[PDB]
Structure formats: C-alpha cells, structure tokens
RNA sequence: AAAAUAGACUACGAAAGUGGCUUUAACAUAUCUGAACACACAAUAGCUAAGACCCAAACUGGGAUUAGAUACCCCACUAUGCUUAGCAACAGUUAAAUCAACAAAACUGCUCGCCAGAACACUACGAGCCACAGCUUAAAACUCAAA
C-alpha cells in the first residue's frame with residue numbers, strides 16, 4: 001500500500017513542478033510556453 | 046674523468062667486426078665470481 | 092641503461108655454443124644495444140632440473156653479457172630469449188656495478 | 197675553577213661493531229658467499245640473530261639468495277655440497 | 289614535444305671536450321640510453337631557460353611551478369598507458385590542485401611572471417566558483433526554462449517596440 | 450592457484466592495504482585550519498549481459514530414523530563461490546593545586562563540526578538521491594519527573 005501512495009505523491013509533485021514552471025512564463029507575459037519547450041518528467045524513471 | 050674513462054673503454058667493446066674473435070676468446074676463458082668471508086672479515090680468494 | 096644478461100645455455104659442442112652466442116649478441120645489437128664484454132663462467136650442473144622447450148636439462152653453460160641498451164629494448168630482448176631453443180634460461184638485470192656502494196659506518 | 201667537570205660525550209662508549217660483510221659488495225653470482233648464510237640441511241636462510249649481519253646486509257643477502265635461486269645459480273632445498281667445507285660464519 | 293634522443297645528459301653537457309668524443313660515447317651519454325627521468329630533467333631546464341629570469345634559482349615560485357608542470361606531464365603520460373592506476377590518478381589530481389594554488393599565489397605576488405608562466409607552459413588560469421550547491425534536476429530544468437522565457441520575452445520586446 | 454626461511458625485520462602507502470624474482474613507469478605540496486553539497490579512492494554484499502563448471506553448497510527433491518523421529522546422518526542437483534563487460538585537526542608546555550569516578554597523566558593557544566531532560570524518533574512530512582529491500586537531512590502533538 002506504501003507504493004500507490006508513493007507514486008501518487010510523485011504525480012502530485014510533478015504537477016506542482018509543472019504549475020511552477022507555468023507560473024514563470026505566465027508572469028513573464030508569454031501566453032504559451034517557450035517555443036519548443038516540453039516539461040520533462042523528472043520524478044519518474 | 047668519467048668521460049675520458051668511457052672513451053678509453055669504448056676501444057675494447059664488442060663491435061660487429063670483432064664478434065667472432067671475442068666469442069671464441071670468451072669460450073676459451075673462465076671467470077670466477079665466487080669468494081668467501083671469514084669471521085675476521087677477510088676475503089678468501091679461491 | 093647498463094644491463095647484465097645472465098644466460099644459461101644448453102650443454103652443446105663448441106661450434107653450437109659459439110653460434111648461439113653470436114645469435115644472441117646479434118639480437119642484442121639489433122635491438123639497439125652496445126655490448127661491452129662477454130664472460131664465460133663455465134659449464135656446470137644446474138642447481139636443479141630445468142625444463143625448457145620440451146626438454147629436460149641438468150647441465151648448462153653459464154655466460155654473462157654486459158651491455159648498454161635503451162629501456163624499451165629490454166622487454167623486446169626478453170621475448171627473443173623466450174623463443175631461442177638453445178637458451179635454458181635468460182635473465183636481464185640492471186648491471187651490479189651501477190648500484191652505488193654506500194659506505195655504512 | 198679548572199677542577200670543575202666539563203660538558204662532554206661519554207668517552208668510554210664502545211662504538212657499534214662492524215659486521216663481517218660491511219664495505220663488501222654482495223653479488224647474486226657469488227654463490228660461495230651466499231652459501232655461507234643458509235642451512236646445510238634445508239637451505240633455509242638464517243636470520244640476523246644467527247648470521248649476525250646488519251639489517252641492510254641481511255636484506256641484501258636475502259635478496260641475492262632469492263635472485264640466485266630463481267636465476268639458476270643456487271639450489272633452493274639444500275646447500276650445494278661443494279661449499280660445505282667453507283669457513284663457518286653462523287652461530288648455530 | 290620531447291627532446292631529441294641524441295641530446296646529452298644534463299650532467300654531461302658542460303663537461304669540456306664533449307664534442308671531441310667518439311659517436312659511441314655520444315650515444316652512451318645521450319637521452320636514448322637513459323630512463324625517462326633524465327628526459328624530464330632536460331625538459332625542466334629547457335622550460336627554466338625559456339621562462340624564468342634566473343634559471344639557476346630553483347627555490348622560486350615560478351621554478352617550482354615549472355617543476356610541478358613537468359611532473360604533471362609525466363603523470364599524464366604514465367596514465368595514458370595505465371588507465372587503472374588509482375594511486376597515480378590521485379597524484380596527478382593533487383599535483384594539478386597544488387599547481388593551481390601556486391599559480392594563485394604567483395598571480396597575487398608577481399603578475400608579470402604569472403603571465404610569462406601562463407604563456408610559456410600553456411596554463412589557462414581559472415577562477416574558483418563562488419557558490420558550492422547541488423544542481424539537482426528540478427533546479428536545472430527551472431533554470432533552462434527561465435533562460436528560454438527570458439529569450440522569448442526579449443524577442444517579444446524587441447519586435448513590439 | 451598463492452608465495453615456507455629471510456621476518457627475533459617494522460618498512461612503504463591518504464586510508465583500505467602491501468611480504469616470490471626480473472624489467473619499465475613511479476611514490477603531490479615550503480605555513481596551519483577550513484565540503485553533506487566537487488573530485489578521486491576505500492570496504493560492504495547483491496543485481497544486469499555473457500562464458501566456464503573439477504569441487505563445494507543456501508534452496509528443491511529422494512533415503513534412513515522417535516513415537517511431534519536427527520534442525521543435525523546419506524544421495525542428487527540449483528542460486529552462489531569463478532572469469533570478464535558494466536552499473537576532531539594543528540602548534541606549544543610539564544609549570545602549577547595532578548585529579549568527581551572509571552577509562553587513556555595533566556593542561557594551554559587556535560580553528561572547524563556538533564550538543565542543550567526522557568520518550569515520541571535510525572520516526573512522520575518535505576526535499577535530494579536512487580529505485581524489487583531503500584539511503585541522507587529530520588519534526589510536531591499527547592505523556593512523564595525523571596531519564
């Protein structure tokens with residue numbers, strides 16, 4: 001049962017990281033992400 | 046002194062000319078590196 | 092540097108011993124060596140039985156070859172000694188006279 | 197006062213004595229000398245408490261004995277009978 | 289480049305009459321028939337003559353830097369062949385760090401000699417980092433995005449004006 | 450494959466460690482302190498590809514045994530053992546009254562790290578690293594008068 005909790009936490013962590021990254025370029029004025037940018041999945045093998 | 050000693054010694058070296066003569070002279074000779082020591086530290090030549 | 096080759100050769104007749112010595116010294120010179128002297132220590136019974144090139148030996152002729160060679164030659168020369176069939180055992184060492192005789196007191 | 201003692205190193209001290217082999221060259225080809233420091237019955241190398249040699253000369257003799265044994269100059273399991281009549285320099 | 293093998297040993301270069309000897313004696317007294325250490329000594333004196341003001345002074349910082357540079361080159365040459373020699377890897381790294389420290393001291397004390405050493409030995413002096421912190425994945429990705437966003441915003445600002 | 454004597458030696462190396470012989474390279478640094486986060490090593494067992502397999506042997510089977518047999522004896526054979534390719538420091542003093550106790554005679558100077566009752570807690574959460582087991586950093590609430 002510790003597993004499913006652990007990957008759930010990893011998913012929420014990835015979502016938080018993506019939200020912070022999005023906040024950056026939204027505050028910078030860019031409507032979308034930088035051209036050719038794709039957020040990598042850094043918390044999953 | 047070392048350079049002069051080497052220059053003198055190089056005369057009597059085994060070149061490719063005197064190879065056969067020196068080989069035969071060696072085969073017609075024997076040298077001994079064996080000596081003994083006494084309690085008094087004296088070298089007893091065979 | 093200066094090296095000494097201790098060569099234990101097969102117990103052979105004089106022409107064969109001379110031919111083997113000539114071949115060894117020629118190999119030494121071919122590998123860049125200046126041979127200084129050749130000395131015969133005599134033919135004697137080996138301290139133990141030595142097997143070489145699928146033959147068993149109990150006697151041998153002992154020779155010393157003093158020479159100067161580049162450091163890269165020694166390894167090469169060793170390999171040559173491994174192939175010669177008339178050499179029971181060939182060993183290259185740094186010449187004993189080069190080591191300094193520090194005088195204890 | 198001239199009768200006072202003076203600072204000085206111990207003048208009665210006996211200097212450390214030199215060993216039999218100090219000042220002499222040890223050669224691996226000199227099987228006669230190297231045979232004076234091995235057991236006649238087993239060929240084992242005698243220690244410094246038997247040979248009486250210094251540490252440096254003991255090490256040189258050991259190295260020469262091993263070198264001569266493997267270069268085909270000296271027997272390993274026994275002392276060569278040709279050298280059994282040599283002067284005895286070992287306290288055994 | 290190494291000295292030619294025909295060069296005479298450092299101890300046999302100023303002896304009088306060394307040019308009047310047989311070719312065999314010249315070979316016997318050349319780098320060809322010596323160990324690598326004599327070649328390293330020849331390299332060292334060549335560097336001293338080419339760089340330092342007084343080639344006889346060996347206690348100076350620049351002379352020590354030259355000696356350590358020759359030694360570092362020898363270790364690198366050794367390690368090209370013995371890839372699994374860990375002790376010599378340690379010696380090489382320690383020597384490089386020590387030479388960096390000596391170069392820093394030389395820079396702080398004598399700038400002209402520092403420049404001459406850096407040119408002569410081909411050493412490119414580098415400054416130390418200011419902050420020592422772990423650059424984990426999140427930080428690296430965030431920094432890359434921030435650089436990209438700055439680039440895009442600069443393009444937008446330039447075009448819009 | 451690992452190296453009787455030497456070695457009653459105490460040497461080399463940062464440590465781990467290094468004891469057959471020869472040869473070639475070769476053993477950093479002219480002050481000290483000062484990295485979890487950098488780079489090298491180290492020992493620790495276990496996995497991923499292959500290969501070898503005499504012998505041994507976790508597990509898995511079979512044989513024999515009291516009256517829950519022998520857990521223990523016998524046979525056979527796996528993973529594995531093997532071979533590559535990889536993942537307090539430093540510098541001084543013995544002068545003082547030596548000094549809770551036991552350890553290991555006491556102290557000074559200077560610097561770094563760490564500690565402020567017990568348990569909760571080599572824990573939870575967060576973060577980093579990895580990823581079958583996880584490792585590092587590391588709390589709070591309740592409780593007690595002790596530990």
Ligand code: FES
Pocket residue numbers: 194195196213214215218219249250251252253
């Ligand atoms: S007395 Fe000189 S080495 Fe022993």
Ligand SMILES: [Mg+2]
Pocket residue numbers: none
């Ligand atoms: Mg320090």
Ligand SMILES: [Mg+2]
Pocket residue numbers: 537538561
């Ligand atoms: Mg410290």
Ligand SMILES: [Mg+2]
Pocket residue numbers: none
């Ligand atoms: Mg934990």
Ligand SMILES: [Mg+2]
Pocket residue numbers: 574575
């Ligand atoms: Mg928390």
